[PDB]
Write a protein that binds this ligand. Structure first.
Ligand SMILES: [Zn+2]
Ligand SMILES: [Zn+2]
Lengths: 83, 75, 105, 146
């Protein structure tokens, strides 16, 4: 705890920004399907394209492909919601 | 909230989700006792002895008296 | 509603002939097609519409009790903006006395 | 204790509900506990969340911004929505087996869907169209291009 000040503020802030974006994207789509209408067992993007990616986000690669290949839908939905 | 990043889950509005997040964020951690016990001689502190032996008071009473009351919750 | 042209009175609708036949208590009939095919209306999100807070949002920059934030106005370049949070979705609107509004509102 | 609607447990509301044998409609803190009909998949939190969000009650009224009933048939038109005939003809073109039937009457509702609620509740337009079409016998429903 006394050595927490030795962490880099910028690197922590960037990592928190990225992790927060991932957490928001997957909490939005934990049950909501980007295709539309729940059905979040294992198919489409309603939960995953496989593995365990709904909450982990630390395995990389798989969380990243899902986010990059459904980023703009989430962005436009966020734009519509906050208006 | 300001950047429009708070997305409520299915079943809650953004106001309810925001209130829940704020209520969770403003709860005192378990380590709030560390400064209290660093200032308290348990073999000599009468207040701590009454609280710890069950004679009178609880941990929230000591925390409110010494560290802070925290979030006022009504219903 | 339809106001009778002779006596300034409201007239009933009484759909009979396949269209609206506006009947008044004084016996006048107007027919009146096209414009009055709307019989019932109900907006379900009242209390959160735009015109509910239109006057308040217009007056928000001048209200001294409104929250201000340290953000630059893109129009007049004031260092502060009035911050509003309306609705159950917590819509954040930034407004300025110059007339600038944060896109939404 | 919570005082909001649907979870009103403040005061003696729950004990008076119990002791007065109040009916179901008079209960302000009604709850239910449901177990998945599969002992080996109760472990999956994602499946449980899927089922919980699936059985959550959503009505048409929840997703309506406003609605207008009209005395117009189809095979005239309130002036404020004369622009609707564009997406109307688009629906006619895109749904060949959904042409208007030959019992269409004058009465008809025009409802505006709330897009914010549709996004937040993960409600799709096709879900509405199929939950109203294979529900209502004497009706003819038309939607814009989603
Ligand atoms: Zn008259
Ligand atoms: Zn300005």
């Amino acid at each position: 705890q006394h050595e927490v000040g030795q962490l880099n503020i910028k690197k922590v802030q960037t990592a928190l920004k990225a992790s927060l974006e991932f957490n928001t994207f997957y909490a939005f789509y934990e049950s909501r399907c980007p295709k539309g209408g729940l059905h979040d067992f294992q198919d489409k993007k309603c939960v995953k394209c496989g593995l365990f990616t709904y909450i982990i986000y630390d395995h990389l690669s798989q969380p990243e492909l899902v986010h990059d290949y459904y980023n703009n839908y989430k962005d436009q939905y966020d734009k519509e919601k906050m208006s | 909230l300001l950047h429009g990043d708070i997305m409520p889950p299915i079943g809650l509005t953004t106001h309810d989700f925001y209130e829940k997040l704020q209520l969770n964020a403003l709860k005192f951690p378990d380590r709030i006792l560390k400064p209290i016990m660093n200032s308290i001689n348990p073999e000599t502190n009468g207040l701590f002895q009454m609280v710890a032996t069950g004679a009178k008071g609880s941990n929230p009473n000591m925390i409110h008296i010494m560290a802070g009351i925290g979030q006022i919750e009504i219903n | 509603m339809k106001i009778c042209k002779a006596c300034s009175s409201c007239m009933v609708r009484t759909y009979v002939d396949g269209n609206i036949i506006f009947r008044c208590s004084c016996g006048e009939s107007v027919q009146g097609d096209s414009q009055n095919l709307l019989v019932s209306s109900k907006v379900y999100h009242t209390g959160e519409m735009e015109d509910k807070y239109k006057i308040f949002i217009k007056n928000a920059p001048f209200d001294p009790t409104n929250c201000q934030i340290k953000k630059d106005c893109p129009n007049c370049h004031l260092d502060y903006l009035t911050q509003i949070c309306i609705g159950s979705q917590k819509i954040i609107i930034l407004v300025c006395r110059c007339g600038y509004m944060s896109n939404r509102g | 204790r919570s005082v909001a609607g649907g979870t009103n447990k403040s005061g003696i509301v729950r004990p008076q509900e119990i002791f007065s044998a109040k009916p179901v409609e008079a209960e302000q803190s009604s709850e239910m506990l449901l177990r998945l009909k599969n002992p080996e998949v109760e472990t999956n939190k994602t499946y449980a969340q899927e089922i919980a969000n699936s059985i959550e009650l959503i009505t048409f009224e929840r997703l309506i911004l406003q609605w207008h009933l009209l005395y117009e048939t189809y095979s005239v038109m309130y002036p404020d929505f004369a622009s609707d005939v564009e997406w109307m003809t688009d629906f006619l073109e895109n749904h060949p087996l959904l042409q208007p039937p030959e019992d269409i009457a004058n009465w008809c509702i025009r409802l505006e869907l709330n897009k914010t609620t549709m996004i937040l509740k993960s409600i799709s337009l096709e879900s509405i169209i199929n939950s109203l079409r294979a529900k209502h016998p004497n009706t003819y429903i038309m939607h814009s291009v989603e």
